[PDB]
Design a binder for this molecule. Structure first.
Ligand SMILES: [Mg+2]
Ligand SMILES: [Mg+2]
Ligand SMILES: [Mg+2]
Ligand SMILES: [Mg+2]
Lengths: 118, 68, 57, 199, 227
RNA sequence: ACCCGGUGAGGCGGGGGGGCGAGCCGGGCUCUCGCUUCUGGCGCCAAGCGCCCGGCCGGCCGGGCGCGACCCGCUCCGGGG
RNA sequence: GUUCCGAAGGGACGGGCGAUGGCCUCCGUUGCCCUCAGCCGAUCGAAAGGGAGUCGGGUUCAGAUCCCCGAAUCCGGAGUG
């Protein structure tokens, strides 16, 4: 054949895929940040009560590793309620306070009585 | 055995034959880098009497040191 | 507009309907047209004069 | 004792050149087949000022003879050049201001700027504002030329290295007296940290 | 008869006129360091004055006779490992119910056979990458009076045995049907190698300039010959 | 060997072939050249020729190779040494 | 030392081959081959430089262009669009 460029360049070789002869570690790591360890307990202060009575929201505190998507999925599974949105802030104590606004067709006060905080 | 003949060859370093070999090999080694694996020993007899064997697990590295 | 705003605009608000529309002004467009045409004509003239000289020699 | 200032200047801490606003290196084009056998042409697009240098720089556009591109370059602008001008580069370009051609082809007595001290060096000699060199004499065998440099010296040069025809633009710059330390300060601020010299 | 719309458009590749076509540039490429080094090593071999003891390996047995040499050697190939397995099984059953002559491979085996004068001819590969392992062998073979030939390719020489490479092989004993062919080979090889060793040991090599340098010298000497 | 410079290491040395000169009886020889200079335009991803082949029904559709873009060479080109 | 003594690219329109899913339609995932391919050097460096797109009213004890209400807007995506 011929060379039309004056530069030699490294030819394209073939790279195989991993075909491991044994898994490196024996078992997959168990999911430790699951829907139960992801939300710890809800606040029951005056501000939280005013928020649940007025804005139709709930107030929880969670660990710092949780995303808003993770938080809303966990709320949906544990309390079988639809969620409008989530606002999170890391409190100066250290935990992550999460304000979870519900879909309008649910009632925050009713859900709070069901959970047990009131 | 040829190892003896190679031994006197390498002891006759001032001979024109060995001098030519050493000049060419030195030029090539200088053109190469400073620390590179050789595919096989350049002096098999000397390697054998220093303890090298033609087995899997023995490697040879050719290396360059600045003089003075 | 600030350059990254030009994504939202439509094409007609970004160029004009002409050769080199929105990239070069009309005056220099017309001078470029005239220059190309007259240069090619002069090249044809010099080629035919060269052929005539070759025939003469 | 201590290390003296002329001894500290070589460490390059605060004595490095201020080169942020400089427009690039002023180099002739790389030699090639077209320049060695025929010639090519370019349009002088710009004439600009770079900081720290008296001579202005001419930004010139050639067209690549091997692929569909245009190449931009910076020359030490010979005086009398202008925008929209065609400059010709190569062995057998005719002899007029702004062209570059080997010193072995030009006739003796020619005035030259941006002389190339070794073939391929892209111009080293006589490239300050108003300076030039003179082609004194030729020698076809051994292909060597005598050149008179702006310092009055005479040098033997290979007769196959390029050179720009004309004088470097911006001449007569040192004839105006700097009237004040502010002017001197601004002159040297765009070059380097050496001005307020102490006895 | 055809479309007048079909016209030719010649493209003028003059200086500065048009973009040059993509022609061949294989002798202007920037090669990797290993390719550059291995080419200029051969160039150095052609430049330098190579001593005759290394030069002697360049003068090689010709192809036309090398084919008979190889076809005769092909009969005395050492057994493959599977063949040895077959024969070891076979001896096992025949014991539960003569050594054919072969080639001898290896520089050590060949040199000890030659200095015992048990060898009848010696084939030496021409390109052992330390040459010192065989550089002494032609002279030893001459003094012992053993015929030796130099063959192209340690790879094809070690293809005789079932290995990647072999430096030297030795014909030490053959059969009656091949004694005559061996005699013809031996006489040709001893005429080519053994009886010229004075000029072989006194024939230097290399010392030839590059094509450009020799062309320039030729032009200069032609000028001085004309005047 | 070793050192310096340039480049996207892009056309180097010979040879051929062709054109313009000079002079000798359509001929060879020496030398030389190989295509771009009035203008702030464009220029790539081959036209053309030749030789093969395929599919469908002489036609349609779709491919390949070469010349165009000469050959052979051992240092990428130059400068030192 | 930061382009200097590197075989410094793991990308792509398309074409061909091979398999697959989905009403095997047409596409997608790909696996192989052909073809195309300069980057100036990995990476770090600005809560005053560059950098698309949110404003008005109300609300607390301590938070508001962030919460509530009302009006907007940008970017990305979307077989069947
Ligand atoms: Mg418009
Ligand atoms: Mg100062
Ligand atoms: Mg950063
Ligand atoms: Mg910032």
């Amino acid at each position: 054949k011929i060379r039309t460029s004056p530069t030699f360049r490294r030819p394209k070789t073939l790279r195989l895929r991993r075909q491991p002869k044994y898994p490196r570690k024996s078992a997959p790591r168990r999911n430790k940040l699951d829907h139960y360890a992801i939300i710890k307990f809800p606040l029951t202060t005056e501000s939280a009560m005013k928020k649940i009575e007025d804005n139709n929201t709930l107030v929880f505190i969670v660990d710092v590793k949780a995303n808003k998507h993770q938080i809303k999925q966990a709320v949906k599974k544990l309390y079988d309620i639809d969620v409008a949105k989530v606002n999170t802030l890391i409190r100066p104590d250290g935990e992550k306070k999460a304000y979870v606004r519900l879909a309008p067709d649910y009632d925050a006060l009713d859900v709070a009585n069901k959970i047990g905080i009131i | 055995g040829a190892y003896k003949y190679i031994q006197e060859l390498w002891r006759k370093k001032q001979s024109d034959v060995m001098r030519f070999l050493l000049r060419v090999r030195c030029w090539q080694y200088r053109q190469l880098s400073a620390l590179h694996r050789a595919p096989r020993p350049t002096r098999p007899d000397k390697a054998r009497r220093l303890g090298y064997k033609a087995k899997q697990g023995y490697v040879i590295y050719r290396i360059r040191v600045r003089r003075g | 507009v600030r350059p990254k705003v030009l994504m939202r605009l439509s094409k007609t608000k970004k160029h004009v309907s002409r050769a080199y529309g929105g990239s070069m002004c009309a005056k220099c467009v017309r001078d470029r047209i005239k220059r190309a045409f007259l240069i090619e004509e002069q090249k044809i003239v010099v080629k035919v004069l060269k052929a005539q000289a070759q025939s003469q020699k | 004792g201590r290390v003296i200032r002329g001894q500290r200047k070589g460490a390059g801490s605060v004595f490095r050149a201020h080169v942020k606003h400089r427009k690039g290196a002023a180099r002739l084009r790389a030699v090639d087949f077209a320049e060695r056998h025929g010639y090519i042409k370019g349009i002088v697009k710009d004439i600009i000022h770079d900081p720290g240098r008296g001579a202005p720089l001419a930004k010139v556009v050639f067209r690549d003879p091997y692929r569909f591109k245009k190449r931009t370059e910076l020359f030490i602008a010979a005086e009398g050049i202008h925008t929209g001008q065609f400059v010709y580069c190569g062995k057998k370009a005719q002899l007029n201001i702004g062209n570059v051609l080997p010193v072995g082809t030009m006739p003796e007595g020619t005035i030259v700027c941006c002389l190339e001290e070794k073939p391929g060096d892209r111009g080293k000699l006589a490239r300050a504002s108003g300076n030039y060199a003179t082609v004194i004499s030729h020698n076809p065998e051994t292909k060597k030329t005598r050149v008179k440099l702006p310092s009055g010296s005479k040098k033997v040069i290979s007769s196959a290295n390029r050179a720009v025809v004309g004088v470097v633009a911006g001449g007569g710059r040192i004839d105006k007296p700097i009237l004040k330390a502010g002017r001197a300060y601004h002159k040297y601020k765009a070059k380097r940290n050496c001005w307020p010299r102490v006895r | 008869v055809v479309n007048p719309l079909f016209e030719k458009r010649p493209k003028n590749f003059g200086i500065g006129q048009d973009i040059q076509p993509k022609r061949d540039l294989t002798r202007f490429v920037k090669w990797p360091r290993y390719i550059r080094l291995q080419r200029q090593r051969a160039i150095l071999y052609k430049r330098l004055k190579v001593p005759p003891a290394i030069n002697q390996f360049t003068q090689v047995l010709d192809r036309q006779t090398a084919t008979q040499l190889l076809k005769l050697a092909h009969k005395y190939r050492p057994e493959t490992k599977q063949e040895k397995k077959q024969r070891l099984l076979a001896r096992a059953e025949k014991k539960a119910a003569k050594r054919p002559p072969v080639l001898r491979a290896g520089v050590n085996t060949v040199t000890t056979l030659v200095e015992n004068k048990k060898a009848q001819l010696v084939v030496i590969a021409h390109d052992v990458d330390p040459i010192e392992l065989v550089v002494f062998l032609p002279a030893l073979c001459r003094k012992m009076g053993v015929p030796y030939c130099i063959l192209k390719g340690k790879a094809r020489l070690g293809r005789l045995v079932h290995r990647k490479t072999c430096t030297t092989v030795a014909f030490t004993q053959v059969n009656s049907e091949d004694k005559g062919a061996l005699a013809k080979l031996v006489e040709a090889i001893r005429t080519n190698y053994n009886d010229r060793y004075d000029e072989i040991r006194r024939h230097w090599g290399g010392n030839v300039l590059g094509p450009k340098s020799v062309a320039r010298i030729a032009k200069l000497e032609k000028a001085k010959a004309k005047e």
